[PDB]
Tab-separated table of C-alpha atoms and ligand atoms in Angstrom:
chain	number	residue	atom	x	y	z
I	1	UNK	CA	0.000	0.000	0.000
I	2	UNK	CA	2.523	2.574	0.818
I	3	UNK	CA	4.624	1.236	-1.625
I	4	UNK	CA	1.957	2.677	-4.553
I	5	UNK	CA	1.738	6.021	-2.973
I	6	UNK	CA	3.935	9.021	-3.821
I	7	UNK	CA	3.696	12.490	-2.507
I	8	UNK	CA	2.888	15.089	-4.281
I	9	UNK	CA	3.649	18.808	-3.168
I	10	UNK	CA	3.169	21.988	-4.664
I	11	UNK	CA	0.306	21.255	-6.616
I	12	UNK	CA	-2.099	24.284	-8.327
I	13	UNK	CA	-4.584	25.497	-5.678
I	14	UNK	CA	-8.271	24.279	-6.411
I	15	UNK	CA	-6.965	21.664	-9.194
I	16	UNK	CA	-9.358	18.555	-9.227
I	17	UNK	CA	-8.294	14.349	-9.038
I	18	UNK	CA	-9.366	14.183	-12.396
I	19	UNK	CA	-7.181	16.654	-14.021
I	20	UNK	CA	-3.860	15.544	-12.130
I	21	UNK	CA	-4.423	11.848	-12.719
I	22	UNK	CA	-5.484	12.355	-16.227
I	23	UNK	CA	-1.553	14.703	-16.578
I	24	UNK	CA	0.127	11.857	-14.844
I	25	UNK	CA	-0.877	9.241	-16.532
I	26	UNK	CA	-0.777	10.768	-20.181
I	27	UNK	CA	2.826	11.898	-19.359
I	28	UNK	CA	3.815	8.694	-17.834
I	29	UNK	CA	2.636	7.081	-21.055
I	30	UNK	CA	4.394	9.254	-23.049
I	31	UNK	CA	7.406	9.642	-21.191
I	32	UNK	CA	7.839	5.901	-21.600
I	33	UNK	CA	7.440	4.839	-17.626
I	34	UNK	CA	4.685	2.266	-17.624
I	35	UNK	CA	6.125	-1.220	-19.214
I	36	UNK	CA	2.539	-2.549	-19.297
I	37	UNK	CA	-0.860	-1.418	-21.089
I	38	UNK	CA	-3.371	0.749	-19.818
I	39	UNK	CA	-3.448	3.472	-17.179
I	40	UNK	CA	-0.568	3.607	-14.144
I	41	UNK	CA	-2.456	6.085	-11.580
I	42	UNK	CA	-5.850	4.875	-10.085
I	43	UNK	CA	-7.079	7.671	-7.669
I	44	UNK	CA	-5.771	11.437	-6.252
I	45	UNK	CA	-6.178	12.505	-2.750
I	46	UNK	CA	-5.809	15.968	-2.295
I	47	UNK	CA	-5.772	16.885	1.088
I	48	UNK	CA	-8.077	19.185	2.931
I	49	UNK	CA	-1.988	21.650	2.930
I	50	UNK	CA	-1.320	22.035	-0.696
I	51	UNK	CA	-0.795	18.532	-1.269
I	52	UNK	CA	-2.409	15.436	-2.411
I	53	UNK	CA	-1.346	11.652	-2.757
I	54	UNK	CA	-0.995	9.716	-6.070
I	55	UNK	CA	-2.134	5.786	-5.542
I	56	UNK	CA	-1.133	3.782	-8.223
I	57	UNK	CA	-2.319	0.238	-10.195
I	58	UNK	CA	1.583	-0.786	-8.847
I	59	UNK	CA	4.437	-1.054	-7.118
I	60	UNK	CA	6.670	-0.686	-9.948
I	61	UNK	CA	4.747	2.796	-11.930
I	62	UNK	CA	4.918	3.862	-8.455
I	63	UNK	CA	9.099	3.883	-9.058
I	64	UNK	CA	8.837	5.102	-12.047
I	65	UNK	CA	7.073	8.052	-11.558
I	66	UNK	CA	9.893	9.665	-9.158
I	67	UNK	CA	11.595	10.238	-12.422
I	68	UNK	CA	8.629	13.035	-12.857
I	69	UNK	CA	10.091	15.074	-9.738
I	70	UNK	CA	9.520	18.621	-10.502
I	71	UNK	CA	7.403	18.396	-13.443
I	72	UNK	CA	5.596	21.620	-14.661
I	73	UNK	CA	2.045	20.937	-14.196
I	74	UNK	CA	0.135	23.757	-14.409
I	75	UNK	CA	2.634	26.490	-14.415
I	76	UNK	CA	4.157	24.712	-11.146
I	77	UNK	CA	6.949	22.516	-10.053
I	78	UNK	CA	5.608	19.475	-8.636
I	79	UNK	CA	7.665	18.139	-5.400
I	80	UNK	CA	6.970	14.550	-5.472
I	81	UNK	CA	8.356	12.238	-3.024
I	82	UNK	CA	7.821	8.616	-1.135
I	83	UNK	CA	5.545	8.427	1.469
B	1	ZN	ZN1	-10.315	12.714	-17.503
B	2	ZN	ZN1	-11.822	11.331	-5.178
């Protein structure tokens, strides 16, 4: 469980689940990350902080998605980080 999580900081103020799972996983697909078909990141939980968590379909998109630490999403560097 904690092993498919990733923090993610810095994230646009009033930004919805759909839009950051629908960046992450187009620009995980497209950045080459995910080894299998289909969609790496499940669900967003963005916290009541300026924050939310990423859950992912697995441990190992999970990994790869560190590689996306300070990605530009929304004109701001995402912090993202293990759990
Ligand atoms: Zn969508
Ligand atoms: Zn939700």
């Amino acid at each position: 469980g904690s092993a498919r999580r990733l923090y993610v900081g810095n994230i646009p103020f009033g930004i919805t689940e759909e839009a950051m799972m629908d960046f992450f996983n187009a620009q995980m697909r497209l950045g080459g990350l995910t080894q299998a078909p289909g969609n790496p990141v499940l669900a967003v939980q963005i916290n009541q902080k300026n924050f939310a968590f990423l859950e992912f379909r697995s441990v190992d998109e999970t990994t790869q998605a560190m590689a996306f630490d300070g990605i530009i999403f929304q004109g701001q560097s995402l912090k993202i980080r293990r759990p």
